[PDB]
Amino acid sequence: APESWDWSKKGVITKVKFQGQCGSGWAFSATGAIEAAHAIATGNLVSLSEQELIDCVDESEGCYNGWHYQSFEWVVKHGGIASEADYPYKARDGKCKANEIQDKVTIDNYGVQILSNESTESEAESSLQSFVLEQPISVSIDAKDFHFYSGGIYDGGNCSSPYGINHFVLIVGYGSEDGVDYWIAKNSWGEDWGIDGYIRIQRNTGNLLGVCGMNYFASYPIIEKSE
């Protein structure tokens, strides 16, 4: 296993997107994860529809908030997901038009890892790193400091237990800088935000739940490589 790794350099990651005034980080992390898993498995990178999730994932609550795993389940259940092109983003709740979509990227299954207090931080870090090496994963996180972030490695700043789950990001890799380990996370607030739309989240900080609770709930789409 590499000291560092970054999928955003391997051509399996779409450009950073902008969610606008809609609480859809959950959907962008889900589309982001699906885009990667699909490019890794099949070799084609295509942008996918966050709007279809916002409109069709009835378990979530559209622009108010939602879930990554529920997005993945919906995609398995509905034969796949429409592309960004065929089902454009509007940043507002709309009627589900999934039945009107002719083309879709499909996934084989999906995983979820809900950390328990029986696990240690080391083990949470170990398994997460393992999942990321295989493919980018989506994690829930408390984004209370995000409006303030502009660069460098974020250490949790004002986050504190109990961590709120008000946003999702896409972990695409990890690296180091002067002995400080970090995850490379793709955000969805435009390319001008943070480090070209990404935020480096410090890891191994000691808290089992990680920075702002990002170790808590991981979920990712599963796709068997194409022959």
Binding site: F18, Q19, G20, Q21, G23, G25, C63, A143, F146, N166
Partner: peptide, 5 residues
């Protein structure tokens, strides 16, 4: 509830 840009 969910954060927005």
């Amino acid at each position: 509830k969910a954060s927005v840009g």
